[PDB]
Amino acid sequence: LQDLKFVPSDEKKKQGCQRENETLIQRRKDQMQPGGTAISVTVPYRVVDQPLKLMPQDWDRVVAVFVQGPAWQFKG
Amino acid sequence: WINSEEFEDLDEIVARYVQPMASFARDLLNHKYYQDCSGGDRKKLEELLIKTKKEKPTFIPYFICACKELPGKFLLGYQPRGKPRIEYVTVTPEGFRYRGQIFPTVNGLFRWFKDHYQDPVPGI
C-alpha cells in the first residue's frame, strides 16, 4: 500500500523483516483545490493485523478490510 | 466438529482451539508459582508442598504444575494446615475452568482460589 509494488511474503521472510502488531502507511496524495494548485498531502493510514483488540470507536473508524476467503476470520 | 464446536477448516481449529489454549498454557508456565514436578507427579508436589509448609508454617503454600497424566489440565496443590490438597484446572479456549468457574485471566483465577480455598470441593 505504501509503495504500490508487489513483494511475496516469502521474499520478506528471506529479508527477515520484523512483523509489528500495528503498522502505519504514508501515502502522498495530491489535493483537489481551487485554482489548480496541488499540495502533496501525506495522510497516514493505520493497518491492524488482529482486529479483535479494537475499541468500538476504533471499529467505527475502520473503513476497509481484505478478505482472504473463509468466513471464520470474520466471526467475532 | 470438536466437542460441540464447529470449525470451517484446519486453520480455524489451530488458530482458535489451540492458539488460545497454548497462550493460556503458556501463561500458567510463565507464572511465578509454576513448577515442574517431573511432568506432574503427585508425590513430588506433595513433598514440595510439605517442605514449603515446614519452612513457613504460618503461610499456606500453593503451587501450580502441568499434569502429564491428563494433558490440558494443570495440577493445583495447596496445603492449608495438614495434608496438601490437589485439584485440576482445565485449559479451554475461553480461558481456565476451575470448580465450575471460567476465568479468562490467570490472576482472577488465583484471587478466587485464595479467597475460596476453604469451600467444599464440587462433586464431593
CA distance A26 to chain B (A): 31
**Could you tell me the resolution of this structure in angstroms?**
2.0
Long-range contacts of B113-116 (CB under 8 A, 24+ apart): B113/B62, B113/B76, B113/B78, B114/B62
DSSP characters over B5-71:
B--SSHHHIIIIIIHHHHHHHHHHHHSTTB---TTT-HHHHHHHHHHHHHH-SSS--EEEEE-SSST
CB contacts of A70 in chain B (<8 Å) are 8-9, 11-12
CA distance A65 to chain B (A): 19
Closest C-alpha to B71, from B90, B46, B94: B90
* Method for this entry: cryo-EM
d(CA B16, CA A72): 10
- Using DSSP's 3-state secondary structure scheme, residue B104 falls into coil
Sort residue A43 into left (φ over 0), alpha (ψ -120 to 50) or beta: beta
Long-range contacts of B40-45 (CB under 8 A, 24+ apart): B40/B65, B40/B66, B40/B67, B40/B68, B40/B69, B40/B75, B42/B75, B42/B86, B45/B75, B45/B77, B45/B84, B45/B86
Asked if residues B48 and B64 have their Cβ atoms less than 8 Å apart, the reply is no
Touching check for A56 and chain B: CB below 8 Å? no
Give the CA diameter of chain A: 50
Most A-contacting residue of B14, B16, B94 (CB-CB within 10 A), to test interface: B16
Cross-strand bridge partners of residue A59: none
Neighbour order of strands in the sheet with B85-92 = B62-66, B73-78, B85-92, B95-98, B101-103
